[PDB]
Design a protein around this ligand. Structure first.
Ligand code: HEC
Ligand code: HEC
Ligand code: HEC
Ligand code: HEC
Length: 86
């Protein structure tokens, strides 16, 4: 009974946590911005987030409307070279 990431954040704010007047962006960048305050920039993260920093958005990896808090994305969901999480 795990709650989605979008949920965990909601309880900590609402649907407006990554949505303006309930109007999801039609790109992804606009949202990716929201994930740049209480957290920071990938270029300011581990050596695992850096490598990506400037490639794919958070959600893109931390599928909010799908993933569930406490669920480390799988590299197999992109990398097929045995890539493993560190
Ligand atoms: C950030 C932590 C989010 C919160 C809080 C909620 N949603 Fe969300 N939603 C988020 C992203 C990043 C995206 C897409 C942009 C991307 O980077 O891919 C979305 C998209 C939606 C959609 C799209 C509908 C579709 O056509 O698939 C809907 C309908 C939506 N979001 C609704 C929604 C609701 C109801 C929320 C509160 C329960 C909510 N979102 C919170 C990120 C985040
Ligand atoms: C403040 C308004 C926030 C914004 C904007 C975003 N997140 Fe956030 N997130 C916030 C808090 C207070 C916390 C708790 C821990 C912490 O101090 O950061 C979190 C936690 C997450 C996590 C944790 C995942 C886990 O394994 O527990 C993730 C993956 C996460 N947040 C992702 C995320 C995304 C994708 C956002 C934009 C769509 C985003 N955060 C915005 C507060 C805030
Ligand atoms: C896939 C290429 C990812 C993208 C893009 C982002 N993150 Fe991530 N993140 C990823 C993994 C695989 C993990 C866990 C590693 C494992 O397998 O154990 C994480 C973890 C985090 C955490 C945990 C730290 C904490 O909650 O205290 C945070 C806070 C986090 N990721 C935030 C974050 C943000 C803000 C991103 C966009 C700027 C982002 N991640 C992108 C994989 C990926
Ligand atoms: C798709 C959503 C991805 C997921 C899931 C993860 N990564 Fe990724 N990463 C992605 C792309 C598109 C690229 C580069 C694209 C290209 O072909 O140029 C990368 C790159 C890396 C690298 C850099 C390798 C290098 O050349 O030095 C590393 C080290 C890396 N990715 C690690 C990694 C790990 C450990 C993941 C699972 C926790 C992971 N990535 C997931 C896109 C995506």
């Amino acid at each position: 009974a795990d709650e989605t990431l979008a949920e965990f954040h909601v309880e900590m704010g609402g649907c407006e946590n990554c949505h303006a007047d309930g109007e999801p962006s039609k790109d992804g960048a606009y949202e990716f911005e929201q994930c740049q305050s209480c957290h920071g920039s990938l270029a300011e993260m581990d050596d695992n987030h850096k490598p990506h920093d400037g490639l794919l958005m958070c959600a893109d990896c931390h599928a909010p409307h799908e993933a569930k808090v406490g669920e480390k994305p799988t590299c197999d969901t992109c990398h097929d070279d045995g890539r493993t999480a560190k």
